[PDB]
Amino acid sequence: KNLPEETFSRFLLQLVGILLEDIVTKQLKVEMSEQQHTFYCQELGTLLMCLIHIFKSGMFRRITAAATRLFRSDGCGGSFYTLDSLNLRAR
């Protein structure tokens, strides 16, 4: 028995995990071009803007209450991008 809010928040956060683990460790020439890297940055920008509008506009309350309980808890046995891995990628 899984909640819909859990599925939405896990999907968005694993997508940020994908984008971050791509943007950090992938070389600027031998894999992607310059326009591809700028589009990576633009995609992650509009994704975090959609996440901010979800976390701020107040029409989405259950999604925030879902995110508060899974940001804080650990990854399920390493089967998820846990939060401090995203902090390593951000730092």
Side-chain angles (χ1 to χ4, degrees), residues 25-81:
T25 314
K26 253 182 186 192
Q27 207 158 326
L28 291 175
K29 192 63 174 69
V30 303
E31 288 103 8
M32 86 190 62
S33 178
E34 184 67 32
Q35 196 251 333
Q36 275 172 4
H37 192 273
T38 303
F39 202 73
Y40 259 7
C41 274
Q42 281 159 283
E43 278 172 335
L44 204 151
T46 174
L47 209 161
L48 294 204
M49 200 73 48
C50 297
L51 264 186
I52 275 172
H53 177 85
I54 286 173
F55 285 173
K56 204 165 196 172
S57 200
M59 283 327 113
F60 312 92
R61 312 275 182 181
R62 285 183 169 173
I63 312 175
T64 44
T68 51
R69 82 187 54 193
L70 57 90
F71 264 98
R72 175 187 67 252
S73 47
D74 56 73
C76 320
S79 54
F80 280 91
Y81 274 119

Side-chain angles (χ1 to χ4, degrees), residues 12-20 23-27:
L12 294 168
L13 288 208
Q14 294 303 311
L15 194 54
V16 183
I18 286 171
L19 268 186
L20 282 179
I23 279 189
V24 176
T25 314
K26 253 182 186 192
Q27 207 158 326

Side-chain angles (χ1 to χ4, degrees), residues 1 9 23 46 51 86 88:
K1 284 311 285 163
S9 306
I23 279 189
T46 174
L51 264 186
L86 270 53
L88 288 172

